[PDB]
Amino acid sequence: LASIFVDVSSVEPGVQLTVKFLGKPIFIRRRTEADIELGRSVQLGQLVDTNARNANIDAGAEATDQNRTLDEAGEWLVMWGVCTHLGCVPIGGVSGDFGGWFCPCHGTHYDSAGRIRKGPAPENLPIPLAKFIDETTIQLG
Numbered sequence: 001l002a003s004i005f006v007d008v009s010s011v012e013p014g015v016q017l018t019v020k021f022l023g024k025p026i027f028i029r030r031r032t033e034a035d036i037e038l039g040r041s042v043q044l045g046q047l048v049d050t051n052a053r054n055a056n057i058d059a060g061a062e063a064t065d066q067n068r069t070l071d072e073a074g075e076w077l078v079m080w081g082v083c084t085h086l087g088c089v090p091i092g093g094v095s096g097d098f099g100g101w102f103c104p105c106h107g108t109h110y111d112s113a114g115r116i117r118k119g120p121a122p123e124n125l126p127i128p129l130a131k132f133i134d135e136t137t138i139q140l141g
């Protein structure tokens with residue numbers, strides 16, 4: 001009964017919806033074609049953290065762009081908005097130097113798939129249990 005159900009029917013490309021779950025923000029970004037291409041252009045060897053940190057798939061999965069989104073098309077990036085350093089809320093709308101998020105508390109930059117690229121945070125932003133249950137609704141948890 002913890003699960004919640006988020007209507008994403010009105011989320012347009014380039015919009016992040018932020019929902020509170022288990023007391024913390026979940027970011028649901030409908031990624032732009034630029035965000036998607038950028039994420040898919042990164043090689044695993046360039047990443048600080050090569051683990052997908054994704055509750056929905058094998059815990060040893062690589063942090064490819066494809067392993068960071070709910071959908072094959074790569075439009076739906078769902079992550080905990082909780083910096084893996086000390087838990088501040090990363091600032092989005094294509095912030096920081098890697099086309100993603102910037103955490104101002106101690107200067108962590110995350111890329112367009114929420115992967116850590118610069119700064120003190122050790123890990124990619126983790127991905128919650130999340131799936132579409134039809135065309136318009138993501139179940140979290």
Ligand code: FES
Nearest residue numbers: 083085086103106
């Ligand atoms: S809490 Fe995000 S960089 Fe320290």
